[PDB]
């Protein structure tokens, strides 16, 4: 693409610089270019990919929520007509958000997931697939909303199945997957009891395996466990 003439290693180097500079759109473009070189990604490289897009879509999601709230208020009883501009601009931001999600999903489908054989890589990418379908579901209102939700669910479920067979209950990727899938159940699938059960079971099974961990591994796992507990506190 645009990055076709730049070396893979230079794209990775520049993604790291862009991260330091908080230039996440640049970071994402560099990492897209790196993926399109066709080689598998290392652990560090997949982390750069995920950080870049998480920050780009995160900003879009926050903006969408602001605009959606304004739009909802404009449609209340007693609200003065202001014309099509709020809807148009919410639609603009939404379309940009959907485009970023489509871009990430495209990278995963061409060809990160199919070449990922190790459990850690495959689960990482399947979690991403679930996450970006979830972000599409947050803004979906038409005749494809059900199908988008089911795509998220299917990706998360495949990731869960692998993670339970192949990874310890304290593994950070496994924990973060479960955290996010639990949020999917609560916020997207209208299944708060499933959300709560998953967060609690995940937390408890991790707690029982902490004794096996080094000081540094313990720190990572406990940090994510605290996020499970925070959600449980919010929901109960």
């Amino acid at each position: 693409g645009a990055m076709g003439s730049m070396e893979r290693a230079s794209l990775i180097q520049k993604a790291k610089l862009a991260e330091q500079a908080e230039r996440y759109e640049d970071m994402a473009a560099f990492m897209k270019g790196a993926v399109e070189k066709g080689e598998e990604l290392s652990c560090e490289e997949r982390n750069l990919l995920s950080v870049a897009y998480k920050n780009v879509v995160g900003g879009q999601r926050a903006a969408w929520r602001v605009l959606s709230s304004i739009e909802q208020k404009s449609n209340e009883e007693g609200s003065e007509e202001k014309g099509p501009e709020v809807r148009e601009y919410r639609e603009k931001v939404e379309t940009e958000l959907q485009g970023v999600c489509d871009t990430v999903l495209g990278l995963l489908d061409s060809h990160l997931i199919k070449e990922a054989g190790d459990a850690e890589s495959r689960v990482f990418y399947l979690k991403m697939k679930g996450d970006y379908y979830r972000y599409l579901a947050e803004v979906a209102t038409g005749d494809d909303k059900k199908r988008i939700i089911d795509s998220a669910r299917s990706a998360y479920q495949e990731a869960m199945d692998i993670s339970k067979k192949e990874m310890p209950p304290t593994n950070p990727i496994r924990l973060g997957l479960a955290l996010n899938f639990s949020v999917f159940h609560y916020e997207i699938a209208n299944s708060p009891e499933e959300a709560i059960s998953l967060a609690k079971t995940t937390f408890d099974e991790a707690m029982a395996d902490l004794h096996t961990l080094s000081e540094d591994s313990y720190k990572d796992s406990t940090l994510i466990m605290q996020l499970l507990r925070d959600n449980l506190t919010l929901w109960t």
Binding site: D131, G176, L179, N180, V183, Y186, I224, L227, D230, N231
Partner: peptide
């Protein structure tokens, strides 16, 4: 909003 990673 709830926590995700």
């Amino acid at each position: 909003f709830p926590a995700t990673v």
